[PDB]
Amino acid sequence: GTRVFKKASPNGKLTVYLGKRDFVDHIDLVDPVDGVVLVDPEYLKERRVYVTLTVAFRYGREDLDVLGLTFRKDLFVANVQSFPPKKPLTRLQERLIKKLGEHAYPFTFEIPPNLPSSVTLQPGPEDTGKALGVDYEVKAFVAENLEEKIHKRNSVRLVIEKVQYAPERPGPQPTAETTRQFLMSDKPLHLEASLDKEIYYHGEPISVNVHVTNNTNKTVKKIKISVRQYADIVLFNTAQYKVPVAMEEADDTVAPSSTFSKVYTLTPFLANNREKRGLALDGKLKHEDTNLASSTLLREGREILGIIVSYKVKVKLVVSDVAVELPFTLMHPKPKEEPPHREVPEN
Amino acid sequence: DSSMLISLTYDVILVILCTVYAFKTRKCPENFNEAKFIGFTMYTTCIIWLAFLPIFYVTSSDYRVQTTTMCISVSLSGFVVLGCLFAPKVHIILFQPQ
């Protein structure tokens, strides 16, 4: 038993059927967007129908929104002639052809690698337009080539999500150390931090082991441990967006010429960060308010394209200050059946 | 000269603060690395002021050289402010409008 997702035009008979709503990638290869279209024989000369896969990228900041400019670009646009008035098919496409009928025209897209995943920036209450981020869309045009204008009635628009999952290899656990020499003679202060693991799932607790060796003439006042999320925007040379999604301040003090080891638990979640405008979250379809953006994996030997999301645990000690950063990956694992891509309890 | 330096110590501290702020954020890629140009401008402005102020104080013997140094310092500071910040921006605006 298998089921597909169908999108129908407001007018006429133009129905697009897609097997799955998520098209994941394995760095080396990307799952192809395979689907079918049913179009009624309502045309006389316009016997050409096109399918366009567009990886649109939009961005807007608070200062830019106030000024009145919002960046927009098309990272990758692929056009395929669905109707052949070569191109191997799949078992799902063959089953769709058999069930739908002879009019079922297939279309297959092979998404090239080194493309950003579907990540949408969280919009504030003021923003009411298109979602800011990278969105993958499939648009069906029943018109004579691309010369004619795009018609809302004829075109079928369906939002698809390209996401990555946690790698099979967990990777070495982060372990970051920093020794600082104070201006008062040669008095070294040592800080070290370690994580339970390198790959982290959304909602899972994060355990950080922090050890401080004070050989100075000052006492540490407070320790701030935060989970910074960084959103590198390669296009338009936009400045890096850094946002603390979780924080913990400890008033404990460490005496000079003494050692102190402790463990801290930080669990990032969206409820506390719901008011952070511009935060990068997972791909959205109809404003479902998905989880935090899964940290993209740059396994390629590394291209400046789209939005690159990363997470780092930052530990800061005051009395200047000593700051250390431990990168970690906050990515969803491979789901058993499929990602629902929506709030499972609708109400 | 002492009164002029007393009046200009506020501007000296102002330049020092601007240079510190520029050095704090140097790798901002906004507007094709505008922070880099700002930092370069601040560094060279600090260099020229440090090389000029003792010279201006010590050249009090002759009025001609003192006035020439006073004019040249501010003129070259203006040329720096133009050609280290606005000049790349003007070049991008005009020569590369795409």
From Swiss-Prot, chain A:
Comp. bias intervals (Basic and acidic residues): 334-345
Q: How is it modified after translation?
A: At the plasma membrane, is rapidly dephosphorylated, a process that is required for clathrin binding and ADRB2 endocytosis but not for ADRB2 binding and desensitization. Once internalized, is rephosphorylated. The ubiquitination status appears to regulate the formation and trafficking of beta-arrestin-GPCR complexes and signaling. Ubiquitination appears to occur GPCR-specific. Ubiquitinated by MDM2; the ubiquitination is required for rapid internalization of ADRB2. Deubiquitinated by USP33; the deubiquitination leads to a dissociation of the beta-arrestin-GPCR complex. Stimulation of a class A GPCR, such as ADRB2, induces transient ubiquitination and subsequently promotes association with USP33.
Chain intervals for the UniProt region annotation (Interaction with CHRM2) = 41-82
Q: What is its main location?
A: cytoplasm
| InterPro entries from the UniProt entry | Arrestin, Arrestin-like_C, Arrestin-like_N, Arrestin_C-like, Arrestin_CS, Arrestin_N, Ig_E-set
Gene Ontology MF annotations: angiotensin receptor binding; arrestin family protein binding; enzyme inhibitor activity; G protein-coupled receptor binding; GTPase activator activity; insulin-like growth factor receptor binding; molecular adaptor activity; transcription coactivator activity
Q: Which UniProt keywords apply?
A: Cell membrane, Cell projection, Coated pit, Cytoplasm, Cytoplasmic vesicle, Membrane, Nucleus, Phosphoprotein, Protein transport, Signal transduction inhibitor, Transcription, Transcription regulation, Transport, Ubl conjugation
Parts of the chain that traverse the membrane:
none
Q: Where is this region: Disordered?
A: 332-347
Q: Name one GO biological process term.
A: negative regulation of interleukin-8 production
* Binding-site residues for 1D-myo-inositol hexakisphosphate, renumbered to this chain: 242, 247, 314, 316
Residue ranges, annotated region (Interaction with SRC) = 1-155
Q: Name where it's found.
A: Cytoplasm; Nucleus; Cell membrane; Membrane, Clathrin-coated pit
Q: Which residues carry this modification: Phosphotyrosine?
A: 43
Q: Tell me if Cell membrane is a UniProt keyword of this record.
A: yes
> Which function does this protein serve?
Functions in regulating agonist-mediated G-protein coupled receptor (GPCR) signaling by mediating both receptor desensitization and resensitization processes. During homologous desensitization, beta-arrestins bind to the GPRK-phosphorylated receptor and sterically preclude its coupling to the cognate G-protein; the binding appears to require additional receptor determinants exposed only in the active receptor conformation.
Q: Share the domain note from the entry.
A: The [DE]-X(1,2)-F-X-X-[FL]-X-X-X-R motif mediates interaction the AP-2 complex subunit AP2B1. Binding to phosphorylated GPCRs induces a conformationanl change that exposes the motif to the surface.
Protein family membership: Belongs to the arrestin family.
**Annotated PANTHER family:** ARRESTIN (PTHR11792), BETA-ARRESTIN-1 (PTHR11792:SF22)
Instruction: Please identify the protein, giving its name as recorded.
Output: Beta-arrestin-1
Gene that encodes the chain: ARRB1
Curated annotation (Swiss-Prot), chain B:
Where would you find this protein in the cell?
Cell membrane
Q: Which residues lie on this side of the membrane: Extracellular?
A: 60-69
Residues on the Cytoplasmic side? 24-36
Q: Give the UniProt tissue specificity note.
A: Detected in brain cortex, thalamus, subthalamic nucleus, substantia nigra, hypothalamus, hippocampus, corpus callosum, caudate nucleus and amygdala.
Indicate the transmembrane segments per the record: 2-23, 37-59, 70-95
The UniProt entry's sequence similarity note says: Belongs to the G-protein coupled receptor 3 family.
Q: What does this gene product do?
A: G-protein coupled receptor for glutamate. Ligand binding causes a conformation change that triggers signaling via guanine nucleotide-binding proteins (G proteins) and modulates the activity of down-stream effectors. Signaling inhibits adenylate cyclase activity.
Quaternary structure note: Interacts with TAMALIN.
Q: What is the protein name given in its UniProt record? A: Metabotropic glutamate receptor 3
- Which organism's genome codes for this protein? Homo sapiens
The coding gene here is GRM3
